[PDB]
Amino acid sequence: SLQIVPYLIFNGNCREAFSCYHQHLGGTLEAMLPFGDSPEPADWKDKIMHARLVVGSFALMASDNHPAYPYEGIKGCSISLNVDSKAEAERLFNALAEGGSVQMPLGPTFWAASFGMFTDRFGVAWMVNCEQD
Amino acid sequence: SLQIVPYLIFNGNCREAFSCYHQHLGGTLEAMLPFGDSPEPADWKDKIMHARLVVGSFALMASDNHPAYPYEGIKGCSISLNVDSKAEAERLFNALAEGGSVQMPLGPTFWAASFGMFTDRFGVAWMVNCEQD
Questions:
Q1: Breaks in chain A at C–N > 2.5 Å: after which residues?
Q2: For residue A28, is it within any domain?
Q3: Has residue A1 been placed in a domain?
Q4: Rounded distance, CA B57 to CA B35, Å?
Q5: Are residues A6 and B77, on separate chains, in Cβ contact within 8 Å?
Q6: Phi, psi torsion values for B2, nearest 5 degrees
Q7: Which segments constitute the Glyoxalase/fosfomycin resistance/dioxygenase domain (chains A, B) (predicted)?
Q8: CB 3.0 to 4.6 Å from A4: which of A79, B13, B24, B58, for a disulfide?
Q9: Using CB atoms, which residue from B5, B72, B124 is nearest to A82?
Q10: A52 - beta bridge partners?
């Protein structure tokens, strides 16, 4: 009960973004549904009405912006990833960061064994964080 | 393992919000570390270095922004709440929206018994979603 899940908004590259989240995060991509194959309007526009990536017991949901609403990227928050090992934190940091940019280089801080901040090439700010080992 | 957790950044009002959040959503507020009692600039701001709210197996995290860095609000993104009751939706939609701003009033849609988008007093976009009773 009571499930809190982040819903994200891309400006057209949701399908590409989730496919990579999938590849690197694992889990099941329960949904990759285009506006075209839905009850929607706009024309030639089968971007993604809704998408759902489930990983163990967490979920990312997303959508390609409706072209009736101005688009600003993602700002107030980031998707933090608490992982169980340094190898995994490095592997994820490396995977999603490629192509994007790094706000805070991966490494130890006073609260974690490995931590970093970055935005991926589809505009999404992540944290990768491993406290343990 | 692997925990996905959304990290919200607030502009000075992280306490007041997570409080409010704590109240409505219930659960446990571990963490409400202010800068003043931090293991780390910019006096005159003893606001929230780190705050963590845990409800069941989910969580929310936040802090007030560093004052150096400019703050563009929280944008491309919304916390989706999923729960079991059309009442529970009404409860959550109503508390968290008080003083807010609505973008889809609470009602049926093709994918949900009850559903609503809004933005709380504190600048956070929420979705509420129900799909049964």
A1: 40
A2: yes
A3: no
A4: 27
A5: yes
A6: 40, 110
A7: 4-128
A8: B58
A9: B5
A10: A31, A61
Partners of B59 on chain A (C-beta within 8 Å) are 4
In the sheet with A77-82, reading across from the earlier edge strand, the strands are A101-107, A114-119, A125-130, A77-82, B3-10, B58-64, B48-55, B28-34
| Residue B1 within a domain | no
Instruction: Give the HSE-up count for residue A115: Cα atoms under 13 Å, Cβ half-sphere.
Output: 11
Tell me the resolution in Å. 2.8
Method: X-ray
**Which of residues 93 through 122 in chain B touch A, CB cutoff 8 A?**
110
Q: Is A72 on the interface with B (CB under 8 A)?
A: yes
Tokens in use for A102? 């790094």
DSSP A122: T
**A111 lies in a domain?**
yes
Kindly state the DSSP code that residue A65 receives in the 8-state scheme. Answer: -
Q: Are residues A74 and A63 in contact, defined by beta-carbon separation less than 8 angstroms?
A: no
CATH at B80 = 3.10.180.10
Chain A residue numbers with beta carbons less than 8 Å from the beta carbon of B110 are 39
As for how many domains chain B has, the answer is 1
Please give the DSSP secondary-structure letter assigned to residue A17.
H
CB spacing of B59 vs A110 below 8 angstroms = no
B81: which 2 tokens?
């709440």
Q: Which of A2, A72, A77 comes nearest B8 by C-beta? A: A77
Chains A, B: CB contacts within 8 A come to 115
Q: Are B5 and A79 a contacting pair at CB < 8 A?
A: yes
Q: Do B60 and A7 touch (CB under 8 A)?
A: no
Taking an 8 Å cut-off on Cβ atoms, the answer to whether A2 and B25 are in contact is: yes
Q: Which two tokens stand for residue A104?
A: 């805070």
